[PDB]
Every structure is written in structure tokens, then in C-alpha cells.
Amino acid sequence: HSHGLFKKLGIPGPTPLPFLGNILSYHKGFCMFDMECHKKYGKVWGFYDGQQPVLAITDPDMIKTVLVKECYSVFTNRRPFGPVGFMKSAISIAEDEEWKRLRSLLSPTFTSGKLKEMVPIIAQYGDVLVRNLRREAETGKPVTLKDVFGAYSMDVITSTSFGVNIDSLNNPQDPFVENTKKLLRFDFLDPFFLSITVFPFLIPILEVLNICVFPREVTNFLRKSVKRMKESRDFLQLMIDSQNSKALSDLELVAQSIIFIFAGYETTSSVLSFIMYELATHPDVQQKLQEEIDAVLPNKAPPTYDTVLQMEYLDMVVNETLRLFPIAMRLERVCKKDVEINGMFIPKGVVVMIPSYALHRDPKYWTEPEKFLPERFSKKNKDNIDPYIYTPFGSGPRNCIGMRFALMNMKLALIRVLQNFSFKPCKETQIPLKLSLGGLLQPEKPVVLKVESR
């Protein structure tokens, strides 16, 4: 509404400009902005994404109330996105009862057991990753990990979310890979998304203008790939089985499968790149992990679902990387009605934000927060960690529904990569690594390392 909201409410924060709000402070990035507001304004602060008031919180008792306790009542949705079109039936886009329906219809799909049946599919794609990484190893040149890791995550998310085993997509150009690489190029963030927050009044203009985020041609191609696969009779196989049992629509099923591709693409690759950078800069950790990988899996044994859940240091290396690098950076909930959370009034429409990046590097909960130290997640130090400060996958009923799949997908990759390759930085390697100023938290310069046969 007005810019005097947090002023009248007595909530500290940066002074906004008349129409821009606090967007000019974003030239440093979402992460550096949140940490600056944390050190300056203390626990709770407020800013304006143009005209939208945003209230940031830090108290874990208050974060739990927003994410867990009062989720279904008030903080059920996130800030409405831009021109969604038919993707309104996406679980990340859906709101209120429509989302609660889609969340339940897809909840049995991401279960331990249903994920256990997908591991033989994901592991087979780790083999293609090992062969393609050894290819750039023979050239004796520093490997750009974004290519190999970006290919693996794309190959896994496509076969799991569409059944089609596209196998090597580093070079082959299946009509699926053609439309997939085209559709996965429709999310450059900066186009519209940033300016949408300044002018949310332009969102309804673009929706009626028939201009959508994903080109309908690729969408039409994705529909045939579902119908032709449906005409033949693993994410699509589990949602089709849900159809044969408020039911689940066929158009809705397409939108949900598209979300899984966007969700698990740059996220899985970035983390896999963030991890290998830390394994290279801290080779004492990489060696200790390879010893555990070879102990649980001798002679480059295949990674089993149960063995991955037994490798403990692998779990510690992934968790410590996700602390230093929360890909989402923030969690956001829209206040649906005037409420008082743990002794603070939040009016209707205000977006409540949790600076995950700032909390993951807050010196109160962490010691030497900037140094990569996997032992923070040891068995002796696993209990004193607040699950509402460390939220790389969010929390509450609206958390990352693809968390178990993502961690398994990435751990299966690291096994076959570490049990066959060693990683050391080159001259082009960025020390210290710089973070991207975009909206996904990526390595500023792509991770450039060297690989060995071992």
C-alpha cells in the first residue's frame, strides 16, 4: 500500500524511494542486502519491493509460526508471480485450496520407497556422467563443471519426469532435447521478473496479451510426449497411476511435470558445482569422503539407495555446502489476514521473508560462518542446530517437495564422480569464489577444475 507502513508500525528498515522502493539496494544482490539489514536493523526489519511491503523475520519461534504453525491459515501462499498463463495449476504457482489439493495429489510421489525405485534410473545416468567427464580428462584441459553437471541434472530430471530415457544429452538432439533446451532457456530471471516487482500492475496486462513464459510450441510438444507415452500403456508414471484411483486433471499433470524440470535443473547443477569447488579448495575433506565412498562401496561399487543413506560424511559435505549456498536465498510467505505472530502485528498483504542466506551465515548460530567446515553436521553437533535457522529446503507444509529426490540425485552423482576422479584447482579457478548478483545464487565464474583418473 503506502510506504509509511513499517514507519507507522515502528519497524526499522531502509528508507524507500517514492516509486522504486528499496530496489536500488539490490545492486549488491539479494544476499548482501539481507545480511546488511540484519547487522544494522537487528532481528526484524522491513523494506519495499517497489510498492510491496516486505517484513523480514529472524526469531526461530516466529519463523516456525509462519512456516509450520500458521501455514494453512495465513501464510499459505507466496508473492504472486508474473504472467503465468496455464501454469496457474503448478504447485509452486497455485494458491490456497488449489495448492492444498495439488500438494496432496503429488505427496505420495516424493516418498522414501517411491524414490528408492528411481535410484536405478538415476544411477545409470551417473555412468554417462563418468564417461563424459573422462572425455575432457583425456584432453588434459581444465574442465568446465557446468557442462558435465548441467548435462547430468538435465538427463536425470527428464527421464524421471517423463520416462523417456534420453541417455546422453551432451550432444544428441532428440526432439525432446530440442524443446527442452529451448524451454530451459526461457528462465533468464532478469527479463520481466525484476521489473515485475516494481510494476505489479503490469502482470494482468501481459496475461491477457497471450504472451507466456514457456512458448506454447514447446508446451504443445510436451503434451504429445505425455499423450504418446500415455498411449503406450517415472514421475509421469506415478501421477498417471494417481489418475486411475477431486481427482487430477491431464492439463494439470503437464504443468506439474514442467515445474520439476525447472526446479531440478540449475539447482542440482549449481549445488554439484558448489560442492566440488569446496572439495577442491579443502582437499582434506575430498580425501576423507573418497575413503568413505570406497569403504561403503569397494572397487567403485554401484551406489545403492540404502548405502547412500549409510554414507554419513557424504551427508555432511552436502549439508555444509547448502549452508554456505542456499540456492533459494530467501523464503517468502504472503500474510493473508491481519495477525499478531509472537508479539508483532503484520497487516494483510505484507510479504514475510526469511533471509536464509543471512541466517546461514549469522555469527550467533555459527562459528567462522564463511569457512567450509563439514564437521558442523557431525553426530555430536547435529542436535544443537535449529531447523528454522538452517532452511536450505525451506520448512513447513510448503517446503521443497523435491528435497529427497534432489539429495539422492546429487549424492548418487558425487559417488561415481569421487570414486573415479580427483579434483584440484587450476590457474583459472576463482579463489575466493564469487557469488552471482542474479536471483538464483550461482558461481559468478563457472567452476574451473582439473580431473584425474585415479
Ligand X SMILES: Clc1ccccc1C(c1ccccc1)(c1ccccc1)n1ccnc1
- 400 is an interface residue for ligand X by CB under 6 A: yes
- The distance in angstroms from the start CA to the end CA of the chain is 61
Q: How far lies 427's CA from each of 42, 393, 444, 447, in Å?
A: 41, 34, 16, 12
- Report the partner that residue 198 touches, choosing among ligand HEM, ligand X, none (CB closer than 5 to 8 A by kind): none
Strands (E), 152-260: none
Binding mask 369-398 for ligand HEM (x = CB under 6 A): -----------------------xxxx--x
Interacting residues of 348 by C-beta distance below 8 A, sequence separation 6+:
335, 336, 337, 338
Binding mask 396-435 for ligand HEM (x = CB under 6 A): --xxxxx--xx-----------------------------
Rank residues 52 and 342 by Cβ distance to ligand X and give the closer one: 52
- Report the partner that residue 357 touches, choosing among ligand X, ligand HEM, none (CB closer than 5 to 8 A by kind): none
Q: Give the other-Cβ count within 10 Å of 220's Cβ.
A: 11
Of residues 329, 330, 350, the one with CA closest to residue 339: 350
Binding mask 308-347 for ligand HEM (x = CB under 6 A): -------------------xx--x----------------
Q: Identify residues 66-85 at the interface with ligand X (CB under 6 A).
A: 78
Rank residues 5 and 440 by Cβ distance to ligand X and give the closer one: 440
Category of 21 on φ-ψ map: left (φ > 0), alpha (ψ -120 to 50) or beta? left
Binding mask 66-105 for ligand HEM (x = CB under 6 A): -------------------------xx----------x--
Rank residues 29 and 394 by Cβ distance to ligand HEM and give the closer one: 394
Binds ligand X (CB under 6 A): choice among 223, 342, 440, 446:
440
- Report the partner that residue 260 touches, choosing among ligand X, ligand HEM, none (CB closer than 5 to 8 A by kind): ligand HEM
- 156 is an interface residue for ligand X by CB under 6 A: no
- Report the partner that residue 440 touches, choosing among ligand X, ligand HEM, none (CB closer than 5 to 8 A by kind): ligand X
Helix (H) or strand (E) holding 354: strand 351-355
- The answer to whether 268 touches 410, Cβ cutoff 8 Å, is yes
- Report the partner that residue 262 touches, choosing among ligand HEM, ligand X, none (CB closer than 5 to 8 A by kind): ligand X
Point out which residues pair with 345 in neighbouring strands.
340
Residue 321 to residue 377: CA distance in whole angstroms: 11
Q: Give the other-Cβ count within 10 Å of 359's Cβ.
A: 27
Q: Count residues contacting ligand X (CB under 6 A)?
A: 10
Of the ranges 63-71, 178-186, 259-267, 279-287, which one interacts with ligand X (CB under 6 A)? 259-267
Binds ligand HEM (CB under 6 A): choice among 271, 339, 412, 415:
271
**C-alpha cell belonging to residue 160:** 524421471
Residue 324 to residue 319: CA distance in whole angstroms: 9
Judge whether 400 is annotated as a binding position: yes
Place of cell 502485528: 345
Q: Identify residues 244-263 at the interface with ligand HEM (CB under 6 A).
A: 259-260, 263
- The answer to whether 35 touches 357, Cβ cutoff 8 Å, is yes
Considering just the CA atoms, what is the radius of gyration of the chain in Å? Answer: 22
Q: Cβ of residue 360: shortest distance to ligand HEM, in angstroms?
A: 12
| H-only helix segments in 265-311 | 266-281, 283-296, 305-308
Binding mask 298-337 for ligand X (x = CB under 6 A): -----------------------------xx---------
Strands (E), 125-267: 143-144
Q: Count residues contacting ligand HEM (CB under 6 A)?
A: 24
- Report the partner that residue 405 touches, choosing among ligand HEM, ligand X, none (CB closer than 5 to 8 A by kind): ligand HEM
* 269-272-278 Cα angle (round to 5): 140
- 262 is an interface residue for ligand X by CB under 6 A: yes
Of residues 167, 123, 166, the one with CA closest to residue 413: 123
Helix (H) or strand (E) holding 175: helix 175-183
Place of cell 560462518: 369
CA atoms within 13 Å, Cβ hemisphere of 256:
28
- 152 is an interface residue for ligand HEM by CB under 6 A: no
Q: Which residues bind ligand X (CB under 6 A)?
A: 78, 92, 259, 262-263, 267, 327-328, 400, 440
Residues within the interface to ligand HEM (CB under 6 A) = 91-92, 103, 259-260, 263-264, 267-268, 271, 327-328, 331, 392-395, 398-402, 405-406
Which segments are annotated as binding site? 400
The annotated binding site for heme is made up of 400
